[PDB]
Write a protein that binds this ligand. Sequence first.
Ligand SMILES: CCNC(=O)c1cc2c(N3CCOC[C@@H]3C)ccnc2[nH]1
Length: 154
Amino acid sequence: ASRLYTLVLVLQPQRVLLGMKKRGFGAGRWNGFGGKVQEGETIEDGARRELQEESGLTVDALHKVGQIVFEFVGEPELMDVHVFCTDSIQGTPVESDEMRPCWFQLDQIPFKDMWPDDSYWFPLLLQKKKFHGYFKFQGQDTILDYTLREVDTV
Ligand SMILES: CCNC(=O)c1cc2c(N3CCOC[C@@H]3C)ccnc2[nH]1
């Protein structure tokens, strides 16, 4: 029982674009751009669509860098998150109803205002490693269990 999600990190050589989530689950934290994959679109299509809906940006290409499965205690569906990177943005990011985009220098990532699991996997993404992750949460603050490794194929 899982549901496909996307997450896109716009990672340029000395900075990364994150969006302050303004509403829904995880509001108040800086996230990458993404959401649920819809009937009738590929995972990469859905990643592109959400990046455009949430920041205005389009891209030349996305690169698959990770997969993360989230379990929330008491929730029947696992989140199957397909994580992509890009450094070919077209446009200037703009605020949407859902996200307030801001650039962060790579030594000033706002980890204390991010999901706690980010402290584990986001560095792998920054190191250009591909990864598979699993995090079991109780609520939004507590990681009960996790697994994390690098992989050759996502
Ligand atoms: C480095 C940027 N990191 C994230 O953007 C990020 C999002 C996220 C998360 N949620 C759950 C609710 O739907 C949105 C998202 C898939 C749960 C746990 N860790 C997360 N990290």
